[PDB]
Amino acid sequence: AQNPNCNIMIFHPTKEEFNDFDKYIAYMESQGAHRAGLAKIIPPKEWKARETYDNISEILIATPLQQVASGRAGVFTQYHKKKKAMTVGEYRHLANSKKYQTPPHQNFEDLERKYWKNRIYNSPIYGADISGSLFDENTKQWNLGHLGTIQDLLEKECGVVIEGVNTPYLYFGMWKTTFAWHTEDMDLYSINYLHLGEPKTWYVVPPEHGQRLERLARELFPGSSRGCGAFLRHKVALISPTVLKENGIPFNRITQEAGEFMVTFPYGYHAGFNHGFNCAEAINFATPRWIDYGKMASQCSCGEARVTFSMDAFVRILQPERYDLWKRGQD
Ligand SMILES: O=C(O)CNC(=O)C(=O)O
Ligand SMILES: [Mg+2]
Ligand code: NI
Numbered sequence: 001a002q003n004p005n006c007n008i009m010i011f012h013p014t015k016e017e018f019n020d021f022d023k024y025i026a027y028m029e030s031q032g033a034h035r036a037g038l039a040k041i042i043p044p045k046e047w048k049a050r051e052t053y054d055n056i057s058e059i060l061i062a063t064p065l066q067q068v069a070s071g072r073a074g075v076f077t078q079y080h081k082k083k084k085a086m087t088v089g090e091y092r093h094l095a096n097s098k099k100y101q102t103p104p105h106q107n108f109e110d111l112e113r114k115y116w117k118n119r120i121y122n123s124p125i126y127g128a129d130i131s132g133s134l135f136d137e138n139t140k141q142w143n144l145g146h147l148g149t150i151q152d153l154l155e156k157e158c159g160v161v162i163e164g165v166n167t168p169y170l171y172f173g174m175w176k177t178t179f180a181w182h183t184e185d186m187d188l189y190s191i192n193y194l195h196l197g198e199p200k201t202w203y204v205v206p207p208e209h210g211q212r213l214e215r216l217a218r219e220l221f222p223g224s225s226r227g228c229g230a231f232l233r234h235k236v237a238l239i240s241p242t243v244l245k246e247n248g249i250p251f252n253r254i255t256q257e258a259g260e261f262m263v264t265f266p267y268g269y270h271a272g273f274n275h276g277f278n279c280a281e282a283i284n285f286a287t288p289r290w291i292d293y294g295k296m297a298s299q300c301s302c303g304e305a306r307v308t309f310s311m312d313a314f315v316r317i318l319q320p321e322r323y324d325l326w327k328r329g330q331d
């Protein structure tokens, strides 16, 4: 069995190997990459996402989100307070202001320490979930706006033709902006490219151990757990590495830098934070190996998780027994 300790693997494809996305994902899995829940892919030196970022300040962040924490430093939730619209140029200036900027630090480890010590005492503003792409249309390799769609994968594997679309999303971050512990919708893959700026630190639980994280989360967030049998779908709960280690939860960590891709694998729980002003692009995707995970994915029906249009068909086809309850939670 490849990668039996479920370590995060780092890949360096050549330009030739970068041509066929599906084939490379399957290669990484042949080497056991999925067992970690997360892999890093460093593009060949010949590749570029676009020519320059010199012209992005006019993108609008219609609904910036202030991430307000509650709890203790290592076990907290965050809620998103909506803020007035601002441009990326305005958001970058805010990120760099004395109130929001990255503090002086020695190295990524020192900054990680400071994040977990101090996160709860601040409320950083995240420009998350913005439909759009920064890949040049002429970038042919690993262009996250030109991937095969999840609807086409389901149709190819299962024969069923469904409505829905699959487009990328932009994320503009600042120091301490946080992504809570989650798996993807319908336990899909994700791919994330860090276009520019400061790093992103990731934490991940191997898919084979995801239920250990769920059981800890029920213990740590007991009111939330009574409210919903899949409350991690709400994407609000944080648990620090120190708390994970105290409770014996297997996990790994890695820091993504500008120019690098990360892939999350089906049912790989992940969480993390941004080091400073940055911009990432991410999209969900599927492969044949996903179908079994999609059929078994938990679902929130309490009303909180509220998701895209395209998830309806995935539930309807892969999970018909659950469909009526889940759709009530959507409505
Ligand atoms: O970058 C972020 O804030 C969150 N991204 C993801 O959870 C992902 O790419 O799957
Ligand atoms: Mg612009
Ligand atoms: Ni994710």
Ligand SMILES: [Zn+2]
Residues within 6 Å of the ligand: 227, 228, 229, 230, 231, 233, 234, 300, 301, 302, 303, 304, 305
């Ligand atoms: Zn719920």
